[PDB]
């Protein structure tokens, strides 16, 4: 029932993990519009490194395109492609 | 080449998702300690409800206990049990 140390350590160590990101984090110019969904699932570097001096950073990136609805106040629904950055590989590097 | 609306929509909607969480976010009283790993994998509510006014909240929780190392550059290391809250169910609920 207790999770064993090495299992914890290996599962939390710096790697790309599916992360639910708010579209406004990625598209801050668009905060007065409404997106549906309002958040998207992306692969992003997460977890921790062996030292508080190191940070988990992307070493390979790519775009993903998704079909997202956007509506401006008092306009009709638009739908289209929106692109987001994904993290394919992560490493621990000095801050 | 393009992720379809419904696939994005379902995949990002409020649910419990593996989240990498820094131990100091959970145990802020303990910043006098170096933990290894410094972060832990926990099932936590995430994503979006698509309807500001609706919020993604835990509706069922449990605990999970993990072996964490606590170190001191002077002293020898200890391995101890630390308990964490997990989110078992999440729901979109009126704010």
């Amino acid at each position: 029932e207790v999770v064993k140390f090495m299992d914890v350590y290996q599962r939390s160590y710096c790697h790309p993990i599916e992360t639910l990101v708010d579209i406004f984090q990625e598209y801050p110019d668009e905060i007065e519009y409404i997106f549906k969904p309002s958040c998207v699932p992306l692969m992003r570097c997460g977890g921790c490194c062996n030292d508080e001096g190191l940070e988990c950073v992307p070493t390979e990136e790519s775009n993903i395109t998704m079909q997202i609805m956007r509506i401006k106040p008092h306009q009709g629904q638009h739908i289209g492609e929106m692109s987001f950055l994904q993290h394919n590989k992560c490493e621990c590097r000095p801050k | 080449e393009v992720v379809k609306f419904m696939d994005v929509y379902q995949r990002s909607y409020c649910h419990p998702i593996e989240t990498l969480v820094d131990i100091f976010q959970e145990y802020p009283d303990e910043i006098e300690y170096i933990f290894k790993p410094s972060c832990v994998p926990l099932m936590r509510c995430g994503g979006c409800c698509n309807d500001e006014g609706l919020e993604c909240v835990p509706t069922e929780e449990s605990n999970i206990t993990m072996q964490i190392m606590r170190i001191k550059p002077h002293q020898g290391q200890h391995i101890g049990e630390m308990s964490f809250l997990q989110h078992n169910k999440c729901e979109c609920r009126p704010k």
Binding site: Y9, Q10, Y13, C49, N50, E91, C92 | -
Partner: peptide
Amino acid sequence: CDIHVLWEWECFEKL
């Protein structure tokens, strides 16, 4: 062990 890479257990019992 290199602080930059994922450790095995002996990296930690050499701490």
